[PDB]
Design a protein around this ligand. Structure first.
Ligand SMILES: O=c1cc[nH]c(=O)[nH]1
Ligand SMILES: [Cl-]
Length: 224
């Protein structure tokens, strides 16, 4: 099916170069299901980050791959449905850095939709995973799709801050080598990496300063 039926029109146009590759991922996922290998998030959420406008992205957050526990991943990186408790460990760590950085109260729930509505792209390098099996779809073809997405954002030459969480930061910095783009990296907020440099990294305020430096508006990070 055309990308216009799956994602927002700006993103469908941006992802043109990889439309074949998306179709290929569709076929891969169907074959996974036929083989009894379920994946997460749900099909209809795989491309959810791309359903918010391409032209409005001011901050890109890039994680690794989706939550591996059924019931967590929703297609916006790090987000969960509002009724999910406990929060997954990465999100609880995100939220503690949020309060330390911004001084806002702990959020009421784990739903990051407000960020997505305000120009934050909640991306993962790999857009699917098998239950209970982190990184199990690494190297299966998403990387070309997400590379196109990152490079197409950069190519707009609009103010853009990328927050790179975890191992793929190095790989990714060159994709953001363009005017009006800044990439900032840290270790990932996951259980055993967060205390190796995610905590104390102050990404929210930093992104805002960098945006304002460039003449852009800051993100209102405040969650209900
Ligand atoms: O979306 C998610 C969830 C956990 N870890 C990630 O890297 N991204
Ligand atoms: Cl986690």
């Amino acid at each position: 099916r055309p990308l216009s039926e799956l994602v927002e029109r700006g993103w469908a146009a941006a992802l043109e170069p990889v439309a074949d590759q998306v179709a290929h991922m569709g076929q891969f996922l169907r074959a996974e299901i036929a083989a009894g290998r379920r994946y997460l998030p749900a099909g209809s959420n795989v491309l959810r980050a791309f359903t918010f406008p391409f032209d409005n992205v001011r901050v890109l957050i890039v994680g690794q791959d989706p939550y591996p526990t059924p019931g967590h991943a929703v297609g916006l990186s790090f987000s969960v449905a509002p009724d999910v408790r406990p929060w997954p460990r990465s999100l609880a760590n995100i939220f503690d850095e949020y309060t330390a950085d911004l001084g806002y109260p702990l959020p009421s729930n784990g739903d990051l939709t407000p960020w997505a509505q305000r120009g934050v792209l909640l991306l993962n390098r790999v857009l699917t995973v098998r239950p209970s099996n982190p990184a199990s779809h690494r190297g299966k073809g998403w990387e070309a799709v997400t590379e196109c997405a990152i490079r197409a954002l950069a190519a707009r030459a609009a103010p853009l801050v990328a927050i790179l969480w975890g191992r793929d930061a190095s790989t990714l910095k060159p994709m953001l080598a363009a005017g009006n783009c800044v990439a900032i990296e840290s270790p990932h907020p996951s259980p055993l990496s967060a205390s190796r440099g995610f905590f104390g990294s102050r990404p929210f305020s930093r992104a805002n300063e960098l945006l304002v430096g460039m003449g852009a508006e800051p993100i209102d990070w405040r969650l209900p």
